[PDB]
Amino acid sequence: MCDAFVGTWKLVSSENFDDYMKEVGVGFATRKVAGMAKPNMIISVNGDLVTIRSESTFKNTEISFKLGVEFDEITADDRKVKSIITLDGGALVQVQKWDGKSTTIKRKRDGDKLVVECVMKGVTSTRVYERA
């Protein structure tokens, strides 16, 4: 399950992430630190349970989830959200909902890349990772 996503991924490019974070509501200082971070993303699967870790000097976070089962999450910027992650067309699609708001984070395999597209109210950020 989700075999293609398994690995340790290193950030190679980031586009429009500051604007994305502004739209989400991330504070100025936090945006500054999060933006200069070069996280690794470590994805693993154990049976039906997927784990995604994000590691950097900014923060270390981890989520463990089952596809299609809503779960509670504290994000790296300290929002308490309800998250649902689905596999749609080979892409892992995560929707986070909080305070009447929503954002979508799509993780897709493209060649030897993992491409992460984050969208909120039509503001989009794209982060590309490659295997470490």
Q: CATH number of the domain at 49, please.
A: 2.40.128.20
Binding residue per annotation — 69? no
- Residues of the domain holding 75: 7-131
- 73: number of CA atoms within 13 Å, CB side? 24
Is 131 within any annotated ligand binding site?
no
Structure-solving method = X-ray
Residue 79 falls inside a structural domain: yes
Q: Is residue 1 part of a domain?
A: no
Show the CA angle centred on residue 69, arms to residues 119 and 76, nearest 5°: 45
The answer to whether 129 is a known ligand-binding residue is yes
Structure's resolution in angstroms: 1.5
Domain count of the fold of the chain: 1
How many Cα atoms within 13 Å fall on the side-chain side of residue 75? 20
Contact 16, 30 (CB under 8 A): no
